[PDB]
Design a protein around this ligand. Structure first.
Ligand SMILES: C[As](C)(=O)[O-]
Ligand SMILES: C[As](C)(=O)[O-]
Ligand SMILES: C[As](C)(=O)[O-]
Ligand SMILES: C[As](C)(=O)[O-]
Ligand SMILES: C[As](C)(=O)[O-]
Ligand SMILES: C[As](C)(=O)[O-]
Ligand SMILES: [Mn+2]
Ligand SMILES: [Mn+2]
Ligand SMILES: [Mn+2]
Ligand SMILES: [Mn+2]
Ligand SMILES: [Mn+2]
Ligand SMILES: [Mn+2]
Ligand SMILES: [Zn+2]
Ligand SMILES: [Zn+2]
Ligand SMILES: [Zn+2]
Ligand SMILES: [Zn+2]
Ligand SMILES: [Zn+2]
Ligand SMILES: [Zn+2]
Lengths: 257, 257, 257, 257, 257, 257
């Protein structure tokens, strides 16, 4: 009926897990400012959309996504001084991932794909996985396998990059509310993007270090780390296809039928 | 426009908070089995739906809802031994609520309505609020106000109850996947309900005590605590309006514009 | 000798546990204001007294009671803003329950009755039990059984309620320092109750929601949620025999020799 | 007319704290094996008894005692491998002390005397105090003062030691269930002591290091670290009076009127 | 005398802090496998050596370094399945950083440079800083400034990269026990590096995702992610001067006299 | 050729552990003021020096030492109000010890000697050990043995004490920056001691209780608890050999081949 676990009855879910090779996917996002031109739930919407499409291709199921993520960092997300951005402490995010894995194992599930959509989440997701696997080991369970990834890492083909950045690629480091996400949003949730509001400032540049308390003067006023002026639905559809295809293939490789 | 914070840009959010009487609403649900006839994200869908309607009428905003809640208890949700049900440890839920309040305070927001949709969440939501307010006090903030409630508590009117349970009301204690929720779902998400699957068993009853480890034999096989056979969109619509109107008035009273 | 573990030598205790079917009882109370007419250790004294009597009747033992419980809530205990009331954070209470169960398992005990006397403790006791049972499982122990209850839940019989509330029962929700506890104290510790100090105010009434920071104005001045003016030692003796008999029978059922 | 906070109404407590010079005392014990001749709640009973007598002489109030303490260590309490002994994890004890100090400060109290009765508790009580004071500081409170002491430390005077130990004193290192404690119990709770069970074994001695997992063979079979055969009521009455007087003086010195 | 705080008397340290503009530097490393050719304390030795030289150049002091860091990750450090590697859980590392910052603030210090030498530590160092700064804020301190950096990030000049990697720079992703660290060790601790033990395997290549439990088969047998065959003392001297010069300038900029 | 794990390659370490009888030693110190005449890293340097010499004699290996320890206490370290002293919270130190033991067990190691050099660390090291052993049990490991000791406890022989304190030994209670440690430092790191700066003040003494917030006036201005004027290299060389020999024998006794 649906690839979303939340829309299934427990009997339907139980039956899918009973199959023996059931793959579950968990989107991990954040509520974070994304400039003057885009909504703040982008980091949840994108990995969730990708999960949905991948799940439909490989016959997987998608768990409710984590709506709040780790604190936004200046050099990757603009900084946690912006209003709207609502961040969790590291222990909180870590504990959430850990609890979910513990429960999935209780269900009998043994295959999980954690799809991150918020850069800063990475290491806390990692600690959550480790702490959960540690407990499972104490419970005599060592066959639970986890694949963790950030969907954008699948866009590495030079050909695609050239098509996405005709004037050259500066790296994902400045991709917060920039061309990459804005394009994907234009292809998935266009009504949540107001391109005319984009502030066309030069790419953010930082020295090889970080400063705390976060200094607002060091992040472009709009919150974006690069201009999304050249973003488009076409680019978004290209990104989506590349991500969906590459991830579906990776999951097939790691969790063969 | 949208009443969902996640769909706003940080500038739009900032402007609403800048108004001075901005009311924020946070749905807190769970992924929990709800019988053979209904999906598992009910505890998220319902309080979120009520929040949306209330927010539209009073000019409030709704934060992304918490998808996972505390462990299901036998006497209220059937028990955490059911597959599908994916629960958090108490410290995790408490920490999530606490972090969000801390961040909302940072934004300059001072009015929050926590709408619970999962009975078992209550005390951990309470602790999250207390710990957060304790920190705000240390930070020199004492004007942050929180109103917490479970939407179903607003169905008090005997006339309404009579209209909802023409055969006599047995209490909310057995209302897990029963008439109350099923009726709401029939009016909001009919495609996520199939009354034909309803197992018409007698209302669950228990002795005045609890037993751990949870014993599956003490919970009706389907997971429901009462039959939803008499559920109807009509009953659902009545319930919805009653809750929306009552909650809207409660908020107008506690957070006068 | 005694039914109190603290009054036994480790040799005696060891011998009792060696019986193989030894039942242990742990009272969990609190230090909380109980109006102008009763002392603040009521939530410890009452469950302890019930445990003592039940333990004597069925041959069980009683562990030292927890003297401090979770934060008093307005709608059930008046609120944590009252002086005298000395509350623990949830993690502290949960951890205390968890540590004790771990230790009892180490002793070889496998049967525990947790008798709550402070309404607000419930869910934290529940979490303590779950976390402890989780650990025991990792330790290879799955035969530890726990029965958790609040002594007042055993007073259900309409004929009993009738005698206790001839003018009509309004529910346990207003029973903080009211007729129920005051009657029990009059029968158990008359010297710690001064009925002449009772403030006969109308029953506390609240809207279908909760407000934080707790608003002192919403709780009856004396701290009571209802008047104990009609309390009596005779009503207390009835309540005691009903609770002792009901609980004793419950334990015989769950923990047969 | 009680010195115990638990036996006072919140109004009586409030009035005493309103004096502005109220001294509060918190007994901290443990449930620990104490040989074949004595009960296990000794570490709670003694400091409580001393607190009662001191409070009566200086006009102080006594808080409910902590019934469970830190894990028993071989060289001082016999070891945590003994049945009956029910110990808390360090974080639990620390958190308990921290929570109480926070609440007492909320009451407006500013003078606390923690009376330890279980040697192993010391450092966790210290951490609890430090964490609480750090927190009070954030709340703008720096006038909260705490005095921590173990009643036995007030038995210094060689003259007194002479009477207690004629054949020479050997330090409190082996004073667990020995002459010192048994004598106090014979004077306070003789019904909880049976010298006819005292195993007259040689004083326990250990190498200059500790071993974990704890080795049972390194602790005298009885659980005691020294024989209490020569214990007596007379000796107890001596110790008691010396401790009560000495401690009362110290409190008058630290919390001068 | 020495730039190491540990080798100063508390009087000397106090005098330096009393200067009002004293900069403290804290090396954060790890105990981790570094192939067959280098010792396991490299992540401590390197940042410490850089701090030493930077401190001497701009007159700062160096705090004792953190010897244990976060769990080694496959794609960055080879994996935590290797023997020798001794890692801390995230909460432990975060808490250590938090504690030290709190203490330095107590000293009156307000300038800190956290120099990371183990890639995986980064986000836990960040959380330590945030939690510590949050507390300081509660204490009324908002003038404590922190500069966090990984020393290798200062080697970015194209001309410098060309010299170090004439064949072509493949990126820092594969720099664990490779050319970069080995060259530095050759120049700083030649006796702890045996280049003749280097296993000249192809650069480690990984798909755009991570797998847990870590699969030993996915990491080159030696533990290195790239061959240090072309490492040299001369390349090390170049890296050292670039790092020391770049970092010293950064500190002069962020912490002017 | 090195006894330090940090200076070994993972292969060398692996080989030593593969033997099956490898003994590991973990120095646990602190950064703490030690008067006007000595450096602050003393508590790390001494236990480490002893570990090195013991390891060389019995064939053990020395892990990187813990540089930061628990808060300094007035009666033993002068107090945590002194500048320079940088202390961890109890949970942090406990967690660090716990994580290391967990990792060593993962390596296959099963014999650990924890050598404390900072008195105040004791109980938190104990808790870390207990929590780790508890975890190991859940993992099916019960053959991990730990020996905890403070190197100064092996210096008790009257013949030795006589030479060290020919004028009378007052106990280790006042041994903070006194003759004992200063003598060891004069023998191991004379450059880190300026005996001319010693403040020949009378031995510190305190009432039989503690006060918090710590009162500065109760600690000798210098920070020392006893004058080290009597210190000498010869005395240190005596202590060193005594400890090294005693500890080596103790280890041979507990971890026999
Ligand atoms: C830099 As991002 C995709 O977490 O906004
Ligand atoms: C008892 As319910 C509304 O949380 O499923
Ligand atoms: C509501 As009550 C029995 O915990 O005071
Ligand atoms: C050594 As004791 C007084 O804590 O039993
Ligand atoms: C990748 As590294 C410098 O932490 O070994
Ligand atoms: C009393 As000490 C050796 O920890 O300074
Ligand atoms: Mn993001
Ligand atoms: Mn529910
Ligand atoms: Mn109560
Ligand atoms: Mn004891
Ligand atoms: Mn590393
Ligand atoms: Mn020390
Ligand atoms: Zn984003
Ligand atoms: Zn529901
Ligand atoms: Zn009560
Ligand atoms: Zn004792
Ligand atoms: Zn490295
Ligand atoms: Zn020292």
């Amino acid at each position: 009926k649906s690839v979303f676990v939340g829309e299934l009855t427990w009997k339907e879910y139980e039956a899918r897990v009973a199959a023996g090779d059931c793959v579950l996917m968990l989107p991990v996002g954040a509520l974070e400012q994304h400039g003057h031109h885009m909504c703040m739930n982008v980091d949840v919407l994108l990995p969730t959309a990708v999960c949905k499409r991948v799940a439909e291709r490989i016959g997987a199921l998608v768990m409710p996504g984590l709506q709040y993520g780790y604190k936004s960092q200046q050099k990757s997300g603009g900084g946690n001084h912006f209003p709207g951005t609502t961040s969790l402490d590291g222990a909180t995010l870590t504990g959430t991932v850990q609890d979910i894995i513990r429960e999935l194992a209780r269900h009998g599930a043994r295959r999980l794909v954690l799809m991150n959509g918020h850069y800063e989440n990475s290491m806390f997701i990692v600690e959550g996985i480790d702490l959960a696997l540690r407990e499972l080991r104490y419970a005599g369970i060592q066959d639970f396998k986890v694949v963790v990834l950030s969907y954008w890492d699948f866009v590495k083909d030079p050909a695609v990059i050239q098509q996405l950045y005709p004037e050259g690629f500066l790296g994902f480091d400045i991709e917060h509310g920039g061309v990459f996400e804005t394009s994907l949003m234009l292809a998935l949730y266009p009504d949540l993007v107001d391109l005319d509001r984009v502030v066309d400032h030069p790419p953010a540049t930082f020295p090889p270090y970080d400063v705390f308390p976060v200094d607002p003067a060091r992040t472009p006023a709009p919150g974006t780390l690069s201009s999304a002026k050249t973003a488009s639905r076409e680019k978004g559809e290209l990104i989506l296809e590349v991500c969906v295809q590459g991830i579906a293939d990776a999951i097939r490789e790691e969790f063969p039928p």
